[PDB]
Antibody
Framework: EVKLVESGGGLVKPGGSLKLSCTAS????????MSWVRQIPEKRLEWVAS???????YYPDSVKGRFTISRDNVRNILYLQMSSLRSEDTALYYC????????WGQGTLVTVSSAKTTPPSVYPLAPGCGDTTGSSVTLGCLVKGYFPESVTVTWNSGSLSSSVHTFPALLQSGLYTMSSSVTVPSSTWPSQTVTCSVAHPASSTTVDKKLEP | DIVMTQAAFSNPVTLGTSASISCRST???????????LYWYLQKPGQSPQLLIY???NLASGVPDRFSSSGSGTDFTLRISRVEAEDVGVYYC?????????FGGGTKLEIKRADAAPTVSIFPPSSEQLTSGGASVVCFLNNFYPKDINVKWKIDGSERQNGVLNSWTDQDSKDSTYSMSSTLTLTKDEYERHNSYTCEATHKTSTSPIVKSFNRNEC
């Protein structure tokens, strides 16, 4: 197996510090130029830092003098020490082995904010009372009032993936709201149950909602 | 640095046909060892970025050979033969000839398909939400094509704009359609002053809007 895994992201006040770390299965950091890159919505990927195998460090002007990249060759851990954080540093941060066959991780979100985390309220979306029609029925879950992104909604433990729509979150007065829909045969709903499970990792919450109940 | 430039969109392609995505560098990416340090990656709707090709000619793991890259000097093209619905997303070029690495702005691959009317579904507020004094009425306008659509809300036959917020998906990876959610949010007290809540969708597939409603007092 080969993968890179970033950690350390979270909410941090402007002016604060935060250290990200990156570990790997099957990549020995000491052997390569290792980097951090970050992704902001609709902005193009931005290089943040590199450290060569010999320990030479490199930074763009946006972060130079504030961010420091370093490596523990014994434990095989890559770090990004972020200091004097700014609102514009808010992004998804990736570690990357950039030369040869490039590799990067799943990313870790850094949100520079005065705000605190807020878990979502999760509400089921089911048809109103009345006569039925149709061979398919569409159900949903409304995931309201959370901060920061992201949430994941899973239907019947992943068993309904093909039929699902995930609606991009919207930000209003510091809180996000998103929804997810699924379409299933009417022959077996509501006779059988459907459940949405909503994970919001930032607040460490997972909530399940059953859709008839 | 080397600047990598791509168009934000390509022309839309029909399923099964070939697509091209063009990328320009300011400077050659060919090194003295004969290798061109160009790579391509994809970001699909709602997934993490996936390497496609590196060093111009090497496919990444899992990548089918209907993906190819060619070019010379400042000019490169990613070709995708026999485009599939799942290919939709934003394709990026990048270089690792130099430090620092530099990245293109991405080109969205768009699929052309047959028109499809929206499936419209309206949902009342949950009992749970109401217990907390809020009332969101949700409408899904699902699996339509083309992407252009209009939604209107009416409360007792009178148009309502205040408190409505809309969200639109990217092109669907499975059937190449588009969807949208529209949510009307009121206080429980406002909600309980009317009975008819109406979501209406206007799309090119018909002159008449598709109307869904429920009645709060019907049952």
């Amino acid at each position: 197996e080969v993968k890179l895994v970033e950690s350390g992201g979270g909410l941090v006040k402007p002016g604060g510090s935060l250290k990200l770390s990156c570990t790997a299965s099957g990549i020995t950091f000491s052997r390569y130029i290792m980097s951090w890159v970050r992704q902001i919505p609709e902005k193009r990927l931005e290089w943040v830092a590199s450290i060569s195998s010999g320990g030479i460090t490199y930074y763009p002007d946006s972060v130079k003098g504030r961010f420091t990249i370093s490596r523990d060759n014994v434990r095989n851990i890559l770090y990004l020490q972020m200091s004097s954080l700014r609102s514009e540093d808010t992004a998804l941060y990736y570690c990357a082995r950039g030369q040869g066959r490039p590799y990067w991780g799943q990313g870790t979100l850094v949100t520079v904010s005065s705000a605190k985390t807020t878990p979502p309220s999760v509400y089921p979306l089911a048809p109103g009372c009345g006569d039925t029609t149709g061979s398919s029925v569409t159900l949903g879950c409304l995931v309201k009032g959370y901060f920061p992104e992201s949430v994941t909604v899973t239907w019947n433990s992943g068993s309904l993936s093909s039929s699902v729509h995930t609606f991009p979150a919207l930000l209003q007065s510091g809180l996000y709201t998103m929804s997810s829909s699924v379409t299933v045969p009417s022959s077996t709903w509501p006779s059988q149950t459907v459940t949405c499970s909503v994970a919001h990792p930032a607040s460490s919450t997972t909530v399940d909602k059953k859709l008839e109940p | 640095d080397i600047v990598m430039t791509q168009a934000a969109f390509s022309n839309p392609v029909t399923l099964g046909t070939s697509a091209s995505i063009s990328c320009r560098s300011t400077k050659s990416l060919l090194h003295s060892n004969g290798i061109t340090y160009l790579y391509w990656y994809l970001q699909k709707p709602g997934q993490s970025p996936q390497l496609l090709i590196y060093q111009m000619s090497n496919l990444a793991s899992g990548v089918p050979d209907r993906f190819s890259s060619s070019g010379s000097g400042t000019d490169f093209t990613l070709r995708i033969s026999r485009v599939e619905a799942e290919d939709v997303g934003v394709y990026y070029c990048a270089q690792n000839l130099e430090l620092p690495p530099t990245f293109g702005g991405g080109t969205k691959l768009e699929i052309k398909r047959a028109d499809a009317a929206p499936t419209v579904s309206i949902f009342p507020p949950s009992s749970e939400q109401l217990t907390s004094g809020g009332a969101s009425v949700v409408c899904f306008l699902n699996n339509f094509y083309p992407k252009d659509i209009n939604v209107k809300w009416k409360i007792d036959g009178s148009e309502r704009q205040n408190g409505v917020l809309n969200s639109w998906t990217d092109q669907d990876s499975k059937d190449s359609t588009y969807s949208m959610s529209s949510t009307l949010t009121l206080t429980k007290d406002e909600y309980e002053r009317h009975n008819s809540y109406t979501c209406e969708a206007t799309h090119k597939t018909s002159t008449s809007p598709i109307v869904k409603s429920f009645n709060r007092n019907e049952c």
